[PDB]
From a paper:
Nitrogenase catalyzes the ATP-dependent reduction of atmospheric dinitrogen to ammonia through the reaction shown in Equation 12. The Fe- and MoFe-proteins are both inactivated upon exposure to oxygen, with the Fe-protein being the more sensitive of the two4.
While progress has been reported in the structural characterization of various liganded forms of the FeMo-cofactor, on-path intermediates have proved difficult to visualize due to the high protein concentration and homogeneity required for canonical X-ray crystallographic techniques.
Numbering used by the authors:
A (entry chain C): 4 to 481
B (entry chain D): 2 to 523
C (entry chain F), D (entry chain E): 1 to 274
The structure:
Amino acid sequence: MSREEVESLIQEVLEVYPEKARKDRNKHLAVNDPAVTQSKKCIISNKKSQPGLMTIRGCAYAGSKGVVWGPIKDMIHISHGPVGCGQYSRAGRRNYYIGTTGVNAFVTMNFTSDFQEKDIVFGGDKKLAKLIDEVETLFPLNKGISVQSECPIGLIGDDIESVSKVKGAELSKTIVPVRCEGFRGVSQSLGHHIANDAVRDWVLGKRDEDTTFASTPYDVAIIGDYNIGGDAWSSRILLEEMGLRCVAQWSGDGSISEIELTPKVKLNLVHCYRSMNYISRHMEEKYGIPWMEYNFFGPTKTIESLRAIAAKFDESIQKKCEEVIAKYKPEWEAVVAKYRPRLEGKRVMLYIGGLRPRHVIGAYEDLGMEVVGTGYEFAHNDDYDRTMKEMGDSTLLYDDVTGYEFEEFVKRIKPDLIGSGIKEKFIFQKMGIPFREMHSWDYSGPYHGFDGFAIFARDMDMTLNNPCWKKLQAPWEA
Amino acid sequence: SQQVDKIKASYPLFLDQDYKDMLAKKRDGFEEKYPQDKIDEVFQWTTTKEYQELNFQREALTVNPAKACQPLGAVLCALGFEKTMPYVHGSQGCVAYFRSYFNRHFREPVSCVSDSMTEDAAVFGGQQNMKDGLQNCKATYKPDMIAVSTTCMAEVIGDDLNAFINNSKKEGFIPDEFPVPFAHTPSFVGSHVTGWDNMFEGIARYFTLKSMDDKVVGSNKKINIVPGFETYLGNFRVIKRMLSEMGVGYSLLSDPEEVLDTPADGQFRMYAGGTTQEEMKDAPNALNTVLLQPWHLEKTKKFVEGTWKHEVPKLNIPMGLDWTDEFLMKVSEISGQPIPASLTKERGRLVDMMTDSHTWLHGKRFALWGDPDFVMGLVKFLLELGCEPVHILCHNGNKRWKKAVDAILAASPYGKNATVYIGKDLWHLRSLVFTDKPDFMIGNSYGKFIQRDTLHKGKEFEVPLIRIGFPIFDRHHLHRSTTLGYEGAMQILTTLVNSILERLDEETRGMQATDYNHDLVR
Amino acid sequence: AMRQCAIYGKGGIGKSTTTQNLVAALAEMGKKVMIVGCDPKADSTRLILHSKAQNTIMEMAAEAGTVEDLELEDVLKAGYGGVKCVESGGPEPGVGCAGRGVITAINFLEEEGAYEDDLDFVFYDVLGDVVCGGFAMPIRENKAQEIYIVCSGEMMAMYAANNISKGIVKYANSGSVRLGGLICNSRNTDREDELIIALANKLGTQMIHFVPRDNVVQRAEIRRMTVIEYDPKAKQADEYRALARKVVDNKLLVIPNPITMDELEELLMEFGIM
Amino acid sequence: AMRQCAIYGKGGIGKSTTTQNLVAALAEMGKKVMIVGCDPKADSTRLILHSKAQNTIMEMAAEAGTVEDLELEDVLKAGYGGVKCVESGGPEPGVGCAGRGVITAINFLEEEGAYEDDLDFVFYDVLGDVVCGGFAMPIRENKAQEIYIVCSGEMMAMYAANNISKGIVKYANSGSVRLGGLICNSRNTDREDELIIALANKLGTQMIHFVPRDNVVQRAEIRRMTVIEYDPKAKQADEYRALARKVVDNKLLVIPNPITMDELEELLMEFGIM
Ligand SMILES: Nc1ncnc2c1ncn2[C@@H]1O[C@H](COP(=O)(O)OP(=O)(O)O)[C@@H](O)[C@H]1O
Ligand SMILES: Nc1ncnc2c1ncn2[C@@H]1O[C@H](COP(=O)(O)OP(=O)(O)O)[C@@H](O)[C@H]1O
Ligand code: ICS
Ligand code: CLF
Ligand code: SF4
Ligand code: ALF
Ligand code: ALF
Ligand SMILES: [Fe+3]
Ligand SMILES: [Mg+2]
Ligand SMILES: [Mg+2]
């Protein structure tokens, strides 16, 4: 658990690699040291993955279609390219929404151009135009269209921008071309950036000359919340009870109309800094809308964030925030009193994507658990700077960890619980360690606010204290 | 608010009054949603014949397809070999998606690697990526064989798998003797089953083509079994059990049964039992080769007939009664082993179950979809059972397969109301089940949404889904079921009859309204 | 100001050398001209930089990791007469994808300013074999507005010009790009002037200039520099200055009208013999 | 026999016409030859077929859906001397991806026989800009075993030949394909023969022949026919006959030895002036 032991473990794990792979991978494993916020602490991120090492990262298409654009309900998102890309991405994420699917909401559906050989050889711009015409014919109540590119689209130089412009002018529809080819970037982060750029270029400035919207001194926009299991609703009920008027949600149970109405708000409450800081900064520079980060994981973080948000408004909002915190205090007090004795002192290792490896630490600490290791898939150095103040001393930090690295680290540290994605769940359940899916909340949730903290504590207790983990070893063996 | 004693997850938490009011206020204030009357009108329109004709006039847009890309099937084929690592040459997002798909279907670890080709590799080629990835994979995960597939990005730019692997071996990145079979699997050609075919042909050609001089047909007194793209472990299990019970020497090539059903005993085995390299090398010496799924094993059949000089029998998938009988009879003819009494008793028990459940099964109307061979066998079994497969859909089918299924349907009186669709997706099937309503629909988990749609038109228009096929995501441990042989026929029969009985029990549960038919004995 | 031209034509017809000599003449006229090579062969800016510049966009993006870590000053250089030269990188023949490299280079140049300057002219020297949409990138909406085709009396050259006009048709209908004219670099064909004039009339465009085949151009290219720098008093230098003046004063921008195969066969059966 | 050769070179250097005339010379010699045009423009088999071949593999596959539904007869045509001619399809310039089309066409030819016949020579005429692996497809394992590069005295042709050798190296290392020799097409440069022979020596290869630049080829091509067919008594017909004889009798097949930019520059400075 000491620094020297963790460093020796790092070297032992890296020993198996070839020289080039070892030299690269040494820079992505580190031992946490607070009061040190930079990339000097032998941790670098946002780099190319080493080939043939079973990485967990996705593509820019996943970061654009699957993350930023897909949860938008009244919009048809077309996976332009071969089949498969959109089939694996179909309904795999739990961005919850309200609507009549197939007539006015299209989050679950899968629209694609289904490229063949002739589409590759002769191009697919005419096919894209015909596809847009058919989409308009068969789904009248769609409020917009987005065209998410895949790898061959970017290779063969298809002009989706011209088609989008012409068809939008012809049908008076908003068509957003996203050049989220999978080979672009090194992970989903470039997909986040490209999606934010497309939002800025094609959707954000639509209502610039419109002043019919009624502004209020209490206008806020929720940024970077994708409503995984209902998280955005759980946050929104708190924010609306404490006095604000949440105009927009970016981009979970969210519509194109509230995306266009975001430039009218007074404050931008950013949850996922990694995926949406670009559009937050753009709105700050253009419309002069301040943006502040907030955390709604666990009672401590949500109380602190609520007070910080209320500090930005008049004293009435702060008074209402005090009332809402007082009202919700006994519920989470009961939850901690029920579940903390069962989970006190348990050690957790996490490996999630760009924001959650550091945001969920407060909720785990509120339950008496210690996070003895964390890592990111696609986070940049600002994410690690934020993380280093939240994570314990002499604790493992990993960037774009490999399957072998994660397996060896878990074998040596021997945690009580691991929070990662679907591609490691059964690996670590085989080894006998309780596993919690921290992407989709293991098909449960929400985990935001106090209403989400109750479910979070219940799920952690359910998985950690299940009797199945006591039966891994057959009685006739030792 | 949450009661500590009774904690509510998203359902039914978001049915609370405060959440309902907040959601209504948000929708009314900032969503600019169409009025509910307009939405209802549009939905009712979508469930009509005019909408069906507009939907079937589609030529460029695909909505809710039922198929995947070739590298998924290539990975599944590569997983069936002993200590073999699937290696997709291309971009990493593809491999992440493949692993997530197979993890969600099998609830098992799925090992596959990528060389993580990027913009730089897209422009300059991925030969350096190939060398580095092969060396890293062999050093780290220590496989006995690396099977290389391709991503659409590498297929577009024309990356030469053979040249890249040869340069990797000649520059010392991997041993010259290490087996690295490869296959070109373009995602814009065919589907996942085509990728399985391509990968198996590549492995067979890697291990057999050069060493054809010393091979004699029938030397090892075995029958090669090529199972194709299979996602039911019970299918491999039943094929092996039937062949072993019959006393037949067999060589099941690309067996992934062990690696997809690893025991949980506190130890993680990345590799489990599969087809050995010795089996693959000795395969030409077998008496013959039987293809379990002949409608997506065309390239493999061509290679086996042209190189190994095996006369591959013209057998259908051993699904149902008649086709299992033909499969067993052909195996007996090829190997000379008589069919044992155990298989005769199993066939008799299947016939007995058919006889017992015929009254409930007869006349039922089914929509269904899946892969070509699976769909063909399911239609054959349904015709044997006396059911009516009204809507037969196969996205990855062709004209020859459609002709074969049409000939099968025309041979039975129960195929009069059946139409076969190729190149149609699940939006087409949603229109069909709205217009020509069947009793049930048999398919993967993606049909659940279709069922939901029907329930929105009314409880009397709902078409229940029976989950048989791939992928099955919303149910647990259904991949252990059997589909092939008499055992699979019994399992499918039980599932169908009990689904019918469950629906009938649900429809007659209303006391004083319809409970006069809530019969204890059925 | 801020004119934008692309140079297309049959492979090996002399697009690169003619473009470089035109650019040198324009710079001699005191104009500020930029040149972008859209060829995987990084040979479009040699005669201005007096060297095969190794600072191509794609290989330096490789050295810097991603394209997002690339800076304009790193790959942009100045040459003879203050001409700015940028080269799009490319793979070795028979590997990779050059169209993607051209797409990436053009997108990088657009994102990081580059053309957001006071430059009068921006030239896009494109390769002979336009085989994908990547090599038509200079012909997109906010890119080169006028296209010049370099051709010669050979019928494969005119078939290439016809095919390139067929390609230009789609990007002209969807944009504001137009065919300025046809440049003729003579290959000592028998009836070259009449043949190229007839082809231009059939396509609806005009003969902008005629460039005689002079070995002074090859001699200059051996010395890594243009005819203007090699021999300011040569007749070929005068012809290049006349061509530069013509393109400066050109005003006929017409959507191409491609002809069929049989029409071309008749064109050179009547205008190519005797 | 069944010798498979691939014709590469700089764009517009004359690979297509030289290949067609060579194939016709072989046809007069009693050899069974088949040409395959790996170019988006179907201009590589016009001379043998006396017309543009409209039955290209990729276009007919697009018309009939998938290339699997195609058949060899619908695309394989015979011409002068019984020379079978096959052409790969391709999109109009500036759209699609021609390399993928070439890959698909070659795979279709390989599956449906074509090569497996009594042909003595199988030629693959490739375009001048090999921008991707699709146009290196004829250089794969069981494809063209000899590569002939068409060069000229102009420096750009020399640099293109060096670049093409650089690209060839990665396929020659991993396979049995070898650079048979350089073919020189005259373009009236000063020291043509000296430059070509020096570049061949530096590359480690040989000059197969020196084809003179004569106007008869323009007249023969205008008539949509080969020079040997147009004027068997002409001097250029004798030169093409000698080129055919030397190609048939070539036994030198080596892995190319590419030279860097500085070596080519110094070679050209020494051998290209005066
Ligand atoms: N007007 C001309 N006079 C003499 N030689 C020329 C002329 N134009 C081109 N050339 C020769 O032809 C070759 C053309 O090469 P290049 O400009 O790269 O062709 P492209 O760029 O059109 O493929 C050059 O090497 C040059 O020596
Ligand atoms: N030896 C030669 N002498 C004179 N002209 C030639 C010669 N070889 C080819 N040509 C001319 O080149 C034109 C065809 O060029 P093409 O074959 O398309 O070039 P490449 O195949 O080298 O790219 C013909 O019109 C012909 O007149
Ligand atoms: S968007 Fe990002 S990988 Fe910020 S791509 Fe990923 S629904 Fe993760 S850690 Mo899946 S940067 Fe969201 C994420 Fe975090 S899909 Fe979800 S859980 S908070
Ligand atoms: S990195 Fe990302 S998911 Fe991969 S392809 Fe590229 S955009 Fe898509 Fe697509 S059809 Fe299948 S899954 Fe690929 S091999 Fe192509
Ligand atoms: S034809 Fe163009 S888009 Fe296709 S692989 Fe070659 S360079 Fe890339
Ligand atoms: F041969 Al080039 F641009 F150098 F067409
Ligand atoms: F033979 Al070409 F451009 F037609 F080099
Ligand atoms: Fe399991
Ligand atoms: Mg050039
Ligand atoms: Mg040619």
